[PDB]
């Protein structure tokens, strides 16, 4: 049950200067990378090519190679078309890919954001605006939908290519996706006193962290956000508010899939 994401970010500072960078995620692991400086798409995993042959990848990369150059000049022309309604700087983001389900089931998406706000999607056989989008976008939508060749290609990428590519990507990447990295915990106290239980280096993301006195769970436990490490593991800290002098007897218990029933209990 994984989500495949192609994240494109494009910045247009003025009429001339323009930049487009992309990253590809399968779940929470990066598979591809495409810097503006690079003519080619880079693999960040050994298995990023999936079950595609070299001829299949070259043909697919070339399509995107043409797209980046085309998209860049397209936007610039669309700005000219709407002037002076819209102007630089312009930020355009694309979130494309497909969500995988048990068996041969999937659902594909292609979402477009303009100035940090979701406005356009490809749905069915055409581009369309979503609820909340400005009306001026109806002309760009009308212009993009005129391009039958693009429409047929995008349909093929969403309906056929994405599901097939990721389905083969899960086979070649089974080893990395199902890896089990053990968490390591440590404790600290910050005056305000607040006890902090740091948990770092665990994979996958699902983890259970709670402050406890013996067999009693403490209700005041506040989990932070999941923070990433450089080595593609996760970091999380849980805070508990206590009166000074009541630290004794408290312990942090950590449950994770890698430990295998051997929960880390850290006493203060």
């Amino acid at each position, epitope marked *: 049950n994984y989500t495949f994401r192609c994240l494109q970010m494009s910045s247009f500072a003025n009429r001339s200067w323009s930049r487009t960078d992309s990253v590809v995620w399968l779940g929470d692991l990066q598979t591809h990378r495409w810097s503006n400086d690079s003519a080619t798409i880079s693999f960040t995993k050994p298995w990023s090519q999936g079950k595609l042959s070299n001829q299949q990848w070259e043909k697919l990369q070339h399509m995107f190679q043409v797209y980046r*150059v085309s998209f860049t*000049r397209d936007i610039q022309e669309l700005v000219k078309m709407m002037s002076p309604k819209e102007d630089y700087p312009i930020e355009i983001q694309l979130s494309a890919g497909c969500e995988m389900y048990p068996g041969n089931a999937s659902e594909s998406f292609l979402h477009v954001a303009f100035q940090g706000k979701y406005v356009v999607r490809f749905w069915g056989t055409s581009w369309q605006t979503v609820p909340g989008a400005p009306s001026w976008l109806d002309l760009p939508i009308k212009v993009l939908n005129a391009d039958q060749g693009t429409s047929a290609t995008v349909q093929m990428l969403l309906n056929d290519t994405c599901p097939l590519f990721v389905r083969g990507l899960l086979e070649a990447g089974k080893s990395d996706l199902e890896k089990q990295e053990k968490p390591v915990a440590w404790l600290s106290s910050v005056p305000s006193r607040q006890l902090v239980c740091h948990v770092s280096g665990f994979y996958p993301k699902p983890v259970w962290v709670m402050w406890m006195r013996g067999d009693q769970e403490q209700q005041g436990t506040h989990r932070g956000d999941f923070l990433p490490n450089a080595d593609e593991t996760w970091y999380l800290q849980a805070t508990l508010d206590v009166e000074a002098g009541e630290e004794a007897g408290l312990a942090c218990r950590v449950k994770h899939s890698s430990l295998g029933g051997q929960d880390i209990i850290l006493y203060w």
Partner: T-cell receptor
Amino acid sequence: TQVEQSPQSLVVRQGENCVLQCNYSVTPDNHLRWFKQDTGKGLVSLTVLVDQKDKTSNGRYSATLDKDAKHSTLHITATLLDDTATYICVVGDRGSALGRLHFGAGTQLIVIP
Amino acid sequence: AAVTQSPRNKVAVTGGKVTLSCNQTNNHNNMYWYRQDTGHGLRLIHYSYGAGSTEKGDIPDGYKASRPSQENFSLILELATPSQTSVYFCASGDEGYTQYFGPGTRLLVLE
């Protein structure tokens, strides 16, 4: 130049067949169009090629397009005097108004009646 | 989808103001100006995406464009030169790729 045409000049007798080549380097290549232009006149569209490997016909004109080879030919069957004109190859880089048209210098055809 | 050009032929002097105009009643948002010269295909000078809009083409130098309305698109030569002796084609189109061309305008700029 991104659009090249061959031959440059062409002299042919009435009733004879001729083929006109168009090679290009335009990226990307959405469609290819052939124009006919009488000496100092307008641009009359003869045909439009749109598919990866396309074939079109229009009376005595027939055309092909190979987008892997970036190449197009225009065949004129049984040439008449009125065919004496310049023939222009045009490539559009988009399937919409966002496209720029790339023009060939043309092929000059003279048909001897 | 008809497109007319006026004038169809013009003899002008160097330094004179020349206004080449074309009309289109097709309700097309987009209009384009090209020039044709021996040994070259048509080359884009200026184009428009609607009233008030003017955009530089591939060879805009020595030319000014004007789009006062949806119907009219004018190519203006403020200071004419003999190098601007050409055949000028105007074209219009909607969102599609098809550009509908006018009959052309012969211009000769003498010294």
